[PDB]
Ligand binder design. Sequence first.
Ligand SMILES: CC(=O)N[C@@H]1[C@@H](O)[C@H](O)[C@@H](CO)O[C@H]1O
Length: 468
Amino acid sequence: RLQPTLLLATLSAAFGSAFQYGYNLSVVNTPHKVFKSFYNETYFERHATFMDGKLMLLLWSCTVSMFPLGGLLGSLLVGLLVDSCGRKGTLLINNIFAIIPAILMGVSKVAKAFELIVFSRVVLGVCAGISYSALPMYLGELAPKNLRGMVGTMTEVFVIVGVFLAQIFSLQAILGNPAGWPVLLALTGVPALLQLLTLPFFPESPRYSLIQKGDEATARQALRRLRGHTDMEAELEDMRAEARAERAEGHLSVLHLCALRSLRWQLLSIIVLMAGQQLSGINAINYYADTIYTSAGVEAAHSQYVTVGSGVVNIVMTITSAVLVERLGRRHLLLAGYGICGSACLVLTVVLLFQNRVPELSYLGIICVFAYIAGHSIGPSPVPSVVRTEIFLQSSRRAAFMVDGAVHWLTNFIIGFLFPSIQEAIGAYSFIIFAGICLLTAIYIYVVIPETKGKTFVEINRIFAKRN
Ligand SMILES: CC(=O)N[C@@H]1[C@@H](O)[C@H](O)[C@@H](CO)O[C@H]1O
C-alpha cells in the first residue's frame, strides 16, 4: 500500500471483516468455565433444578462447533452475494450478520437465555465465512500487481490481529469475569460498526466494475482515487484484455467445474492449498502446547502468558510474511513454511517420545512448538489467501472461492472433531502423520504451483495452461 487512499481502504475493509473471523474463531476456548456456569445458572432459574452433565457437554459442543458450520454455509453463500453486489456491497451486507448477533450476545445475560448465544454463533459463523470468501477478492482486485501481495496478505494479517486481540481480551483478569463475558462477546460488533461507518467512503474494486458491470467510467475514477496520479492507461488495458480473454474463453459456473478443462489444475491447486493449511498440524500444536510448557518447567499459572507470547510471535511472523511476499515470492514462502512445519513436527515427535527419559529435551520441545507456530504463520497461513485469488480470472473467481472456502471450512471442522480420538488412539505419532501431510503438501506445491509474483492475471493463467 503506497497511496494513502488505498492504504486506508485496505485497513477499513480488513479491520471490520477479517477481525470478525479471527475473534469469533478464538474467543470461546479460553473462558469456557464462565459460559458453563452461566448456562447452568440460566437453567437453574428456568427449571428450579440442575441438569445433567451430558446436556452441559452437548450444549457446549454445539455452541463451540456451530462456528465452523456457520462458516461453511457462509462460504457457499458468498456466491449468491459477491457477483450480485460487488465485493463492496458484499462486505457491507456482511456487516449485518456481525452487528445483529453482537447485539444479541450483548443483551443475553439480562434476557436470561443462552440460546441467543448459541444462535448468534451460527450467525457469526455465516458472517465469518462470507468475510473470508469476500475480503480477499476485494483486496486483490483493489491493489495493483506491484503491491498485490501485501494487500492480499492483509487479510490474514488482520485475522491474526483479531485472534491475538481476542486472546488478550479473553483472559480472566481482562474480560473473562462472570459479569464481564457479555462485553467480551459483544466487542466483536465494534469493528463491524466502524467498517459500516467508514468503508462506503472508499471506491469499489475497479476490476469488478469494468470487467463485470461494464462501466469503464466508474473504474476510471476509482483507479484515479486508488492509484493516485501516475498512469492508468495500461492498467485499464489489462482489465479490458482480461475481460476480452475471459469473454472469448469462458468462465467457471459451478455447474460446469469439469467442463472447463483449462482451470482444472488451478482448482486442484487451491483445494490442496487450503487443506494443507488446516490438516497440517496446527490443531496438535494447540493440544500439546500446554503439556509441552508444563514439562518445560513453566507453572500452570503461566501456560497462558506463553500462549499470548505465541500469539505475538504469530503476529510478527505474519507481518514479516506480508513484507516478504513481494520480495522472496509466494512459492518460496510456501515451501519454507511447509518445510519448517514438517521439521518442527518431526523433532516434536522425537522429543515427545523421549520426553520422560531426558527432561533436558523440554527446551527443544518448546523451541519446536514456537518454530511450528512461526513457520505455519509465515508460509502456509497467508500465502494461500494471496494465491487463491491470483490464479483465477474475474468471473471464475466466485466459483473458485466457493469451492476453496467450502473445502477450507469442511477440513477445519473435520480435523477439529477427530484429533481428540487420534491423540488417544495413536499417541504422539499423530505428529508424524501431520509432518507427512505437510511433506506431501510441500511436494505438491513444489511440483505444480508456479511463481505468480508481479504478474497480471492473464499471464498467470497462461503459465498454468502450459503446466499441462
Ligand atoms: C451441570 C453441571 O455441570 N454441574 C453443576 C456444577 O457446576 C455444580 O455441581 C453445581 C454448581 O451450582 O451445579 C451443577 O449443576
